[PDB]
Ligand SMILES: C[C@](N)(CCCCB(O)O)C(=O)O
């Protein structure tokens with residue numbers, strides 16, 4: 032029960048600043064106290080400091096940041112600690128997943144997101160890297176990426192070993208890429224049809240039929256409906272509700288196989304208050320903004336926090 | 340893949356004006372662009388212009404309008420186009436359903452509504468025709484209706500060939516009429532028990548056991564909860580949520596048997612903004628009012644719009 | 648079809664006043680008219696007037712009030728009327744359940760609440776009695792309670808004959824007490840997994856396998872999410888939604904075995920307006936605050952109010 036905390040305040044994968052503030056905000060709201068009360072020990076590593084495609088915005092900053100995160104996380108993973116990577120925008124998942132994958136070759140990835148993040152640079156409508164991160168991680172890029180030379184000999188994630196859950200806002204080209212690469216995906220309609228519980232069980236059975244693989248959770252908070260998670264940059268209607276996202280994290284915790292996790296796209300500057308109700312019982316700052324509080328609660332779930 | 344668009348701005352079935360503005364509002368919000376992007380071709384026909392019961396309000400206007408709609412829609416139906424009838428209050432469904440039924444004798448009707456609209460004039464607490472339209476269409480009226488002589492020799496809809504879905508606000512007398520006429524109905528409690536997916540599958544199996552009948556969808560937007568669809572005149576708590584109504588329309592689209600549809604009771608004057616989030620990706624006007632945007636999205640669903 | 652109405656305006660089980668106003672507020676909103684329209688007859692009894700543990704706040708007032716409620720309710724129960732006990736905070740459930748249990752020895756209790764209310768005085772973080780009421784009723788208290796001598800020879804409720812439904816905010820010690828006493832409990836996660844319908848059927852099957860026992864419903868309105876029930880003192884995120892709580896009450900009504908019920912923790916001073924929509928059809932005051940209106944609707948459900 033040891034967790035390494037890595038702050039990855041990268042904001043270069045998308046237009047806005049805001050997400051660079053997420054790591055320190057969650058600490059301020061009570062990350063350490065929450066981990067403590069759940070009976071885990073932590074080591075907080077602090078924050079990461081900071082022929083070719085030519086159409087990815089801010090790629091130099093992203094590439095240089097990613098090398099640093101990769102090296103730092105590799106070192107934490109070797110301790111056999113659970114590693115919690117707090118973004119930052121979703122661009123931080125590249126180094127997170129690949130570092131975990133080099134150590135855990137049979138890693139299975141659960142990517143929880145309103146979006147596919149599976150554009151390649153030639154299909155992206157925005158040129159924003161956080162909308163391409165999963166495609167990059169899956170080895171789908173067709174040319175070299177500036178400032179990513181350090182990554183060129185790594186083993187990439189396989190689509191059949193990945194499940195994307197919660198998606199509802201996919202670009203025209205992404206729809207094609209999604210079907211073509213044969214990744215396992217579960218849309219909000221699948222969830223409405225079958226329920227979140229059946230959905231995650233189906234996904235886990237599909238990617239880990241023998242229930243014996245390490246799991247990495249990459250959680251984009253915009254998977255959650257805006258009613259509960261307004262503090263995020265790219266909102267899509269009809270998201271996971273409060274009960275659903277909490278249950279999803281609980282079920283993943285109960286596998287006992289989660290080895291690493293990203294929590295990304297939390298933007299405190301866009302967050303709002305309820306605020307404080309009696310049910311906010313975790314040692315989280317009274318009256319905290321609701322998305323930040325939800326992030327801490329979902330981290331608690333992964334660490335075993337349960338109702339009874 | 341051809342759709343005829345008919346604007347039916349009838350507001351005489353209920354107290355308020357507002358719904359007469361719906362047709363042009365949806366055009367302004369991007370109806371044509373939405374249809375175009377989905378790979379359909381449209382023909383926009385424009386807007387319909389405008390011993391006995393003596394207790395139906397505004398019946399002259401309704402009767403005269405209905406003759407015009409019946410004649411106009413009959414002509415579009417003969418083209419074998421999908422026909423989209425945009426109200427207007429629900430009173431427009433009489434001519435819509437009966438014109439479609441004369442052409443498609445084995446038509447099956449899915450009536451999606453918070454209400455039964457199945458009062459007869461002698462049981463109506465309001466005298467408002469939009470609360471009687473389904474009863475009229477089902478041949479339940481017991482006396483002649485002024486200005487409906489043109490309709491007296493038509494074949495009427497049969498209750499066993501109809502399913503009402505989403506109901507939750509039914510008048511005392513309506514409850515009796517509903518049970519008596521043996522229509523198939525699925526309340527919000529049935530939906531809460533079984534889920535929207537099982538519910539529509541059950542309904543379709545009940546009215547079209549051989550999966551071989553043309554389908555008409557009569558969608559009253561007040562079936563949807565006020566949180567998502569405030570722009571409507573008669574609100575009932577506990578409606579379909581955003582995910583549910585989208586899934587329902589998707590499942591109906593996937594039958595490949597929908598031949599005509601009403602979208603009624605949208606009142607732009609009562610609508611509100613979110614507004615614009617990234618997920619609003621259809622070519623719908625940025626920052627559109629939320630009910631209008633939802634209407635366009637649900638039309639998109641019927642035309643095949645899907646997440647992946 | 649006779650109901651005795653007892654107002655139990657006890658506010659001493661928790662810090663705030665407010666709940667003492669609930670009984671008269673529901674009468675003002677139309678309790679009598681609602682009962683009348685459902686074809687029931689009522690008798691409104693009015694309002695109840697008003698070695699040892701030394702750490703229960705306000706226990707003298709609570710103990711003296713409880714003797715009065717016990718005596719008053721015992722008398723109503725003997726009439727073989729359905730007895731409706733309107734709080735007041737949840738402290739009123741002690742005398743309510745025990746009086747009903749002395750008469751109906753095979754009583755089964757369905758406790759609907761965001762909370763367990765199953766602290767004992769030595770584990771309570773607050774010293775507030777309304778957070779201990781279920782533990783007291785279950786005979787879990789280990790010392791005598793001041794001003795409860797009148798209750799010392801009563802038969803107490805058994806955990807195996809009880810089901811708690813909707814829970815989500817449980818204290819650390821409560822979690823242990825809950826597991827230890829072997830009460831049947833169904834958390835909001837169980838409800839999210841299986842749905843409210845399967846959940847209540849499972850609970851009823853567990854505590855009343857032969858479907859032949861009288862049922863007492865103890866409904867704390869804070870079981871319902873704040874979106875629908877803001878008028879309550881102790882809010883917990885992720886509660887039952889409007890559709891769920893209505894369906895739950897309907898299913899319990901349909902057993903035909905409910906003999907008594909508490910409706911507690913409604914605090915009009917914390918309530919808010921929508922307000923009035925067409926769907927508010929019960930004879931409830933136009934524009935009533937939403938929690939009060941919901942309380943009346945849920946009482947209607949127990950008395951047989953249904954959609955069709
Ligand atoms: C338009 C879009 N698909 C948006 C991606 C959103 C990134 B995320 O998961 O927060 C793109 O820029 O590629």
Ligand SMILES: C[C@](N)(CCCCB(O)O)C(=O)O
Pocket residue numbers: 429452453454455456458463464465466467469470471510559561573604
């Ligand atoms: C009271 C009422 N049942 C209301 C009908 C609502 C019409 B609708 O579906 O928008 C009536 O006037 O008959």
Ligand SMILES: C[C@](N)(CCCCB(O)O)C(=O)O
Pocket residue numbers: 737760761762763764766771772773774775777778779818867869881912
């Ligand atoms: C902290 C708490 N568990 C709160 C109990 C809430 C009572 B209720 O069901 O409304 C306690 O005071 O024991």
Ligand SMILES: [Mn+2]
Pocket residue numbers: 121144146148161251296
């Ligand atoms: Mn993402």
Ligand SMILES: [Mn+2]
Pocket residue numbers: 144145146251253254265296
């Ligand atoms: Mn996203």
Ligand SMILES: [Mn+2]
Pocket residue numbers: 429452454456469559604
């Ligand atoms: Mn209608």
Ligand SMILES: [Mn+2]
Pocket residue numbers: 452453454559561562573604
């Ligand atoms: Mn309606």
Ligand SMILES: [Mn+2]
Pocket residue numbers: 737760762764777867912
């Ligand atoms: Mn309680």
Ligand SMILES: [Mn+2]
Pocket residue numbers: 760761762867869870881912
């Ligand atoms: Mn409670």
